[PDB]
Amino acid sequence: ENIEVHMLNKGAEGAMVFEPAYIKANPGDTVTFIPVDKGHNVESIKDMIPEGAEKFKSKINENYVLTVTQPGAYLVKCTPHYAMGMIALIAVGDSPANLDQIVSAKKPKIVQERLEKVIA
Ligand SMILES: [Cu+2]
């Protein structure tokens, strides 16, 4: 199945957001990232994707279709707006083995706050 995500300058959580910022998927699903506002992209965060998953980085302003294979949690960011808290969490399969690790990892305070919220 496909899950559509919008990249926006402003949303329910404030400025520079992914909506939804919490994506539940299963191996084989696709996640479509739509740049509703210009200036955004999607990129996997180093050591914040499952072991065996390939790193990815879309072009600014392009519609990007991500196919998810490996189970686990993935924290993605918008390259330009990471420090402004523009992130999304993709959870593939049940009880992502690396979720606690991602929660604990070093990241910007704004990012951490949004993540905690998304997770809750
Ligand atoms: Cu952005």
From Swiss-Prot:
Its cofactor is Cu cation. Disulfide bonds: none annotated. Binds 1 copper ion per subunit. Induction: Under anaerobic growth conditions and by nitrite. It comes from Alcaligenes faecalis. Its main location: periplasm. It is found in: Periplasm. GO terms for cellular component: periplasmic space. The chain holds residues 24 to 143 of 146 of the full protein. Cu cation binds at H40, C78, H81, M86. GO terms for molecular function: copper ion binding; electron transfer activity. Residues 5-93 form the Plastocyanin-like domain. Keywords: Copper, Electron transport, Metal-binding, Periplasm, Signal, Transport. This is Pseudoazurin. This soluble electron transfer copper protein is required for the inactivation of copper-containing nitrite reductase in the presence of oxygen. Serves as a direct electron donor to the nitrite reductase. The keyword Transport applies.
